[PDB]
Amino acid sequence: AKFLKAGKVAVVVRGRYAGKKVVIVKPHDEGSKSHPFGHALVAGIERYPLKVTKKHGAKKVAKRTKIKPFIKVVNYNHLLPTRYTLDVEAFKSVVSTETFEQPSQREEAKKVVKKAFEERHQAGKNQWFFSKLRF
RNA sequence: AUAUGGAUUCUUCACGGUAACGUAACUGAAUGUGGAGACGUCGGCGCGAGCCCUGGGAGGAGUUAUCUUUUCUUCUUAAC
Known part of the structure; x- marks a missing residue:
C-alpha cells in the first residue's frame, strides 16, 4: 500500500515549481539530519516543449522541442502523487544526496537529465508527463 | 536621446530556500483575468509624532534688609 516509489510521477504544489510535473527518483521516508521530514529527490520540467505542427520547418521544430x-x-x-510512471534508470545514478550542496555537480546532473528527457520526448511516449498543466 | 559597467547565453531567455519566499539585474505581441485609484458612522483599547511637565550639566538675565544650590531664558536637525 506504498506508492511513493523510485519511478512515481507527482505534481509540485509549492515553491517556484508549483503546477509542474515531476518524477520521484530517491525517496527518504524517515527524514535525515537535514530536512527532518519525509522527502524525496525529484527531477522535473521547468520549461515544457511547445506544440509542433506539420507547417513548422526543420529549424523551428528543434527550437520548440527544447x-x-x-x-x-x-x-x-508539497507533492500530489499521480497514477503515472516514468523509468529513471537512465539518470538515477547521477542524482543523489551528493550531487546537491555543490554548484558544479548540480549542473552536471541537470544536463544528463535534459538529454534523457529530450530523447524520451522524441518518439513520443509518456505524453501526459510532457504536457503542461493548465490552472 | 544614447554609451559604458554589471547581469545573462555553447542546456539560449538567472539562481537559492522543504516551504512561507529571497535578490542589483535575470526576453514576452494579440487577447484575456485580477489588483490599486476606491470611500459610512460611533465606542473603548494599543502604538507613533508634536506639545505639556520634569532631573543633571554648560551659558546669559532677574531678585537679594532677610530667605531661596533660587526665578526666567538658550541647548535645534528638513525633503531625500
Whole structure:
C-alpha cells in the first residue's frame, strides 16, 4: 500500500515549481539530519516543449522541442502523487544526496537529465508527463 | 536621446530556500483575468509624532534688609 516509489510521477504544489510535473527518483521516508521530514529527490520540467505542427520547418521544430529540467528536494506534503510512471534508470545514478550542496555537480546532473528527457520526448511516449498543466 | 559597467547565453531567455519566499539585474505581441485609484458612522483599547511637565550639566538675565544650590531664558536637525 506504498506508492511513493523510485519511478512515481507527482505534481509540485509549492515553491517556484508549483503546477509542474515531476518524477520521484530517491525517496527518504524517515527524514535525515537535514530536512527532518519525509522527502524525496525529484527531477522535473521547468520549461515544457511547445506544440509542433506539420507547417513548422526543420529549424523551428528543434527550437520548440527544447526542455529545461530541474532537480529539487521536496517535502512529501508539497507533492500530489499521480497514477503515472516514468523509468529513471537512465539518470538515477547521477542524482543523489551528493550531487546537491555543490554548484558544479548540480549542473552536471541537470544536463544528463535534459538529454534523457529530450530523447524520451522524441518518439513520443509518456505524453501526459510532457504536457503542461493548465490552472 | 544614447554609451559604458554589471547581469545573462555553447542546456539560449538567472539562481537559492522543504516551504512561507529571497535578490542589483535575470526576453514576452494579440487577447484575456485580477489588483490599486476606491470611500459610512460611533465606542473603548494599543502604538507613533508634536506639545505639556520634569532631573543633571554648560551659558546669559532677574531678585537679594532677610530667605531661596533660587526665578526666567538658550541647548535645534528638513525633503531625500
